C-alpha cells in the first residue's frame, strides 16, 4: 500500500458566480490507487500569482461516481488555476493538469421553481417563478425520458408560462428551466417528470 500514482480523471471546472467555482472530477483508475482512497485535495490559486496553491480537503470514500466541490470566497473577475489530487492512508498522489477558469463579474440568477399546469396526449403546460431581484430571459429544457435535451430560448417580457406541443402520447417527458442574466446562466430548476395522455 502506497500513495496514489495517478491524477484524478475527467476534470471539469465552471464558475458559478463572482466568488465561486464548481469543480467536478472522477477518481483515477483502480490500478493507480494502491490503497482505498480517503478523499481528494482541490487546489486553487490566482493564475500567475507567486503565492503557492491553496488546497481544500474533500473527504470522499464513496467512488464510482462523479465528485464535485464548490470553491467559494474567491475574488471577482479573476482567473484561477485549478488542480485536484487523490489521497489514501499513505500519502497524497500526483495532481491533475491545470484548468484555468475565470470568476464571473456578477451574481447569477437563482434557480427557478417549475410546476405543472396541464397535460394532454400531445402537449404539456408549465409555470415557473422568479424569486429574483435583473433577469434577462429564460430557457426551457425538455426531453423524452429516453431521449436528448431540447432547448426553447425565451424572453423575460413574456408571461412565465409555456406549452410544449407536438409530443408523443403515453410518453414521459422531463422538463426544467434556467434563468439568464448579463453575467451568465443560472443554476437549473428541479426536473419535472410527467407522462402525456394516451
Residue numbers in the entry: 389 to 521, 525 to 589
Lines from the paper:
Recently, a shortened Dscam (sDscam) gene family with tandemly arrayed 5′ cassettes in Chelicerata species has been identified, which encodes ∼50–100 isoforms. Chelicerata sDscams could be classified into two subfamilies, sDscamα and sDscamβ, containing one and two variable Ig domains, respectively. Crystal structures and cell aggregation assays demonstrated that both α and β subfamilies of sDscam used Ig1 for the isoform-specific trans recognition in a hand-in-hand manner. Furthermore, the cis interactions were established by the three FNIII domains of sDscam, which assemble into a cross fold with a kink between FNIII2 and FNIII3.
